[PDB]
């Protein structure tokens, strides 16, 4: 399978850009204890992001309850890099939000200020 | 340095009794991604339990939102060993539950299976 | 882009997902507790340092210390370090060079062989 | 039952104080892949500390050979909190060091920074 390689590469990417900088501590702390389930529309699978203080875990399977579920095609997910693009994708129907919309809004705010040094 | 030793001793106790047995897997999985903030009434301090697949983190301070908040004096907290004791503690007023009562019900069911 | 920080993080993610999740791999993992395996990727002329603990494996890009076992091979031969029945042939062929404690790479390959991908 | 609770409580304490701060990264990296066996002299028990990048593992038992072994009574072991403290305990005879003394020196330097 290619899913174990996709979840590991996404985990690597999110942690390198969102969890390395001390400037991103406040944006990361808004996501503390949150689970963001992403339902990939093209493929039959989901990606589950679990947010901690020092890391984000990106899982293929999760027996728990998610605080926010986002349903979209693989192609639209890289566009979730700011609040302006998130409002447009919801409006266009491209992205469906379930649960606490503030989880995905705080994710996109953290992603908007992604940096590595 | 009293509180850091209490949170570490509680974390040690919870993981040794609740996270070691493979028989407790189903009870543990009902607590996955849940946060249980305990407000210790006597000492006016809190203990925050965060539940994962392989462990429970016990923290002195937590900046997030809790799924369930239990308010009681330190003396009543060790009595959360089964569902019969929980129902009595709530009824007597000794224990106060806020949020999702199912988080504390699944905690005492997991604690009942430990010993 | 920082491919090395992303590569070490993606490798760390996979090794932990496949080798550190199953309770069947507990004994194989325990043979590696306290060991450091340095891998020199011949094509890229960069190294990966694996540090083995009880509950996890840490993957570092740089380390100024001395590793218990250093394995030198090209990126393409490294996925072949999954068959315990082949590691002896790998070494004989010259494809993989072992320095230090050969029992570290033998126990890594045996742990990797037990895992299901 | 007592020992699994002691090793787990010590593991919890060491990780909370030594493995949380990014300022302790360099001190932690000197301990990478090292095993420090601690022989508690009062109780007939040992604690084995295994140092990684992101955590310390505290084990009750281990069949391997440790990089360093420290032998002392439970009462003197909380005094291993700085480099001047360790030099005094060795001098006085209160603490016995076996193996690589640099493992315990780097542990006490990491503990001093906390
Ligand atoms: Ca697509
Ligand atoms: Ca939650
Ligand atoms: Ca309080
Ligand atoms: Ca508090
Ligand atoms: Ca809050
Ligand atoms: Ca009380
Ligand atoms: Ca009962
Ligand atoms: Ca019972
Ligand atoms: Ca070693
Ligand atoms: Ca095989
Ligand atoms: Ca196999
Ligand atoms: Ca003894
Ligand atoms: Ca012993
Ligand atoms: Ca442990
Ligand atoms: Ca000093
Ligand atoms: Ca100090």
Swiss-Prot record, chain A:
Keywords linked to the UniProt accession: Cytoplasm, Ubiquinone biosynthesis
SCP2 domain ranges (all copies): 14-111
GO CC, any one term: ubiquinone biosynthesis complex
Source domain of life: Bacteria
GO biological process: ubiquinone biosynthetic process
Subcellular location field: Cytoplasm
Outcome of gene disruption: During aerobic growth, mutant is impaired for ubiquinone biosynthesis and for growth in rich medium, but it does not present any defect under anaerobic conditions.
Coiled coil: none
Pathway membership: Cofactor biosynthesis; ubiquinone biosynthesis
KW Ribosomal protein (keyword) present: no
GO molecular function: identical protein binding
Subunit record text: Component of the Ubi complex metabolon, which regroups five ubiquinone biosynthesis proteins (UbiE, UbiF, UbiG, UbiH and UbiI) and two accessory factors (UbiK and the lipid-binding protein UbiJ). Interacts with UbiK and forms a complex composed of 2 UbiK subunits and 1 UbiJ subunit. The UbiK-UbiJ complex interacts with palmitoleic acid.
Function noted in UniProt: Required for ubiquinone (coenzyme Q) biosynthesis under aerobic conditions. Binds hydrophobic ubiquinone biosynthetic intermediates via its SCP2 domain and is essential for the stability of the Ubi complex. May constitute a docking platform where Ubi enzymes assemble and access their SCP2-bound polyprenyl substrates.
Entry similarity comment: Belongs to the UbiJ family.
The protein, known as: Ubiquinone biosynthesis accessory factor UbiJ
Protein source organism: Escherichia coli (strain K12)
Lineage: Bacteria, Pseudomonadati, Pseudomonadota, Gammaproteobacteria, Enterobacterales
Designated gene of the protein: ubiJ
Entire-sequence positions represented here: 2 to 118 of 201
Curated annotation (Swiss-Prot), chain B:
UniProt-annotated location(s): Cytoplasm
A GO BP annotation: ubiquinone biosynthetic process
Gene Ontology molecular-function annotations: identical protein binding
Disruption phenotype annotation: During aerobic growth, mutant is impaired for ubiquinone biosynthesis and for growth in rich medium, but it does not present any defect under anaerobic conditions.
Keyword Cytoplasm: yes
UniProt keyword terms in alphabetical order: Cytoplasm, Ubiquinone biosynthesis
Annotated pathway: Cofactor biosynthesis; ubiquinone biosynthesis
GO cellular component: cytoplasm; ubiquinone biosynthesis complex
Ranges where the SCP2 domain occurs: 14-111
Domain of life assignment: Bacteria
Presence of the UniProt keyword Nuclease in the record: no
Subunit organization: Component of the Ubi complex metabolon, which regroups five ubiquinone biosynthesis proteins (UbiE, UbiF, UbiG, UbiH and UbiI) and two accessory factors (UbiK and the lipid-binding protein UbiJ). Interacts with UbiK and forms a complex composed of 2 UbiK subunits and 1 UbiJ subunit. The UbiK-UbiJ complex interacts with palmitoleic acid.
Family of the protein in this entry: Belongs to the UbiJ family.
Role this protein plays: Required for ubiquinone (coenzyme Q) biosynthesis under aerobic conditions. Binds hydrophobic ubiquinone biosynthetic intermediates via its SCP2 domain and is essential for the stability of the Ubi complex. May constitute a docking platform where Ubi enzymes assemble and access their SCP2-bound polyprenyl substrates.
Identification of the protein by name: Ubiquinone biosynthesis accessory factor UbiJ
Protein's organism: Escherichia coli (strain K12)
Lineage: Bacteria, Pseudomonadati, Pseudomonadota, Gammaproteobacteria, Enterobacterales
Span of the entire protein shown here: 2 to 116 of 201
From Swiss-Prot, chain D:
GO MF annotation terms: identical protein binding
Localization (cell): Cytoplasm
Domain SCP2: 14-111
KO phenotype (gene knockout): During aerobic growth, mutant is impaired for ubiquinone biosynthesis and for growth in rich medium, but it does not present any defect under anaerobic conditions.
One GO term of the biological process aspect: ubiquinone biosynthetic process
Superkingdom: Bacteria
Pathway: Cofactor biosynthesis; ubiquinone biosynthesis
GO cellular component: cytoplasm; ubiquinone biosynthesis complex
UniProt keyword annotations, A-Z: Cytoplasm, Ubiquinone biosynthesis
Purpose of the protein: Required for ubiquinone (coenzyme Q) biosynthesis under aerobic conditions. Binds hydrophobic ubiquinone biosynthetic intermediates via its SCP2 domain and is essential for the stability of the Ubi complex. May constitute a docking platform where Ubi enzymes assemble and access their SCP2-bound polyprenyl substrates.
Subunit comment: Component of the Ubi complex metabolon, which regroups five ubiquinone biosynthesis proteins (UbiE, UbiF, UbiG, UbiH and UbiI) and two accessory factors (UbiK and the lipid-binding protein UbiJ). Interacts with UbiK and forms a complex composed of 2 UbiK subunits and 1 UbiJ subunit. The UbiK-UbiJ complex interacts with palmitoleic acid.
Similarity comment: family membership: Belongs to the UbiJ family.
Protein name (record): Ubiquinone biosynthesis accessory factor UbiJ
Entire-sequence positions represented here: 2 to 115 of 201
């Amino acid at each position: 399978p290619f899913k174990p390689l996709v979840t590991a590469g996404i985990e690597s990417l999110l942690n390198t850009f969102l969890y390395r900088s001390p400037a991103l501590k406040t944006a990361r702390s808004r996501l503390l204890g949150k689970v963001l389930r992403v339902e990939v529309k093209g493929f039959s699978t989901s990606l589950i992001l679990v947010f901690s203080e020092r890391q984000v875990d990106v899982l293929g399977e999760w027996a728990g309850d998610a605080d926010c579920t986002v349903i979209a095609y693989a192609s639209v997910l890289p566009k979730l890099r700011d609040r302006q693009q998130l409002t447009a994708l919801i409006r266009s129907g491209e992205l469906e939000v379930q649960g606490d919309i503030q989880v995905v809004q705080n994710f996109v705010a953290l992603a908007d200020l992604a940096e590595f040094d």
